[PDB]
Amino acid sequence: GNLDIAVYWGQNFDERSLEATCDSGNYAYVIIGFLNTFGGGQTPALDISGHSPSGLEPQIKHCQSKNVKVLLSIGGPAGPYSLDSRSDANDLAVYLFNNFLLPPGHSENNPFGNAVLDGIDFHIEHGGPSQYQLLANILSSFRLKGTEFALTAAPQCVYPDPNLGTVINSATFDAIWVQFYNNPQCSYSSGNAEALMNAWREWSMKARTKKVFLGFPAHPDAAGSGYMPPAKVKFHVFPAAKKSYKFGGIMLWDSYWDTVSQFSNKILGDGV
Numbered sequence: 001g002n003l004d005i006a007v008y009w010g011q012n013f014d015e016r017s018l019e020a021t022c023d024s025g026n027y028a029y030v031i032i033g034f035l036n037t038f039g040g041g042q043t044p045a046l047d048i049s050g051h052s053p054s055g056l057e058p059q060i061k062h063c064q065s066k067n068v069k070v071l072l073s074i075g076g077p078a079g080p081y082s083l084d085s086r087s088d089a090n091d092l093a094v095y096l097f098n099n100f101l102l103p104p105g106h107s108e109n110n111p112f113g114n115a116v117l118d119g120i121d122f123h124i125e126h127g128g129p130s131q132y133q134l135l136a137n138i139l140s141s142f143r144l145k146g147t148e149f150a151l152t153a154a155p156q157c158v159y160p161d162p163n164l165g166t167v168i169n170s171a172t173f174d175a176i177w178v179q180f181y182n183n184p185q186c187s188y189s190s191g192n193a194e195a196l197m198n199a200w201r202e203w204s205m206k207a208r209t210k211k212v213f214l215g216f217p218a219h220p221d222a223a224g225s226g227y228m229p230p231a232k233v234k235f236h237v238f239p240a241a242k243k244s245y246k247f248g249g250i251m252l253w254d255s256y257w258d259t260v261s262q263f264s265n266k267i268l269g270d271g272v
Helices: 018-023 054-065 086-101 132-143 194-206 230-242 255-261 263-268
Strands: 005-009 029-035 037-039 042-045 069-076 119-124 150-153 175-179 211-217 247-253
Touching (some): 005 018, 005 263, 018 029, 018 054, 029 119, 037 086, 069 086, 119 132, 132 150, 175 247, 194 211, 194 230, 211 230, 230 247, 230 263, 247 255, 247 263, 255 263
Parallel strands (some): 005 029, 005 247, 029 069, 069 119, 150 175, 175 211, 211 247
């Protein structure tokens, strides 16, 4: 039926802008990546491939007025991030709250200006569970203080996830987009979906969240392994996945590549 697609944005200086990405009409969620520097005596920092942070202010608002949810992803595939101590978790929690999830205050200054985002995406790929449980408890606390936003996670496809499984079991995430790529044990391999279908059954049965999305790379070049053509996703996957109460739609890695491949257009019947 209707399909919700989430896509990562911010992976290339030369990519279709954020507002044009929202104007495509293909996505329900746009995830800005990544706040990839924090913890360990480090001041937080963004690596959004050189796009001007402030320049994104009007674009985020345009996206939202067209009803596209805009999230900020912390961590990322690569980066000097870690949340080893309890004070790191608290520091990052209140920094994300003041500067991204709330309207402005004036003894500082929001990296994205006066825009307020719709949520935080945990894209933790190294460091173990550390204090990510604590970080999520505080963010979740604020969510219960009248400032509703969403908390999501992007775990690898092996269950349980070594870095986030512990935290996911707390059921704090509103949505999960499992990365069904870069790992042959649980993604599409050689005209072979057995590994993928098995991973999917596990995640949709055991994951403690309301929505589980299937994450795929939008182009053969976008990831080391796991690419599955659109026609095969609709034929192979969708019949068995819709049969799940937790089916959310799909997540695409990433915007820069979808612009090239037109994967989401093919998946949807190409359009707006």
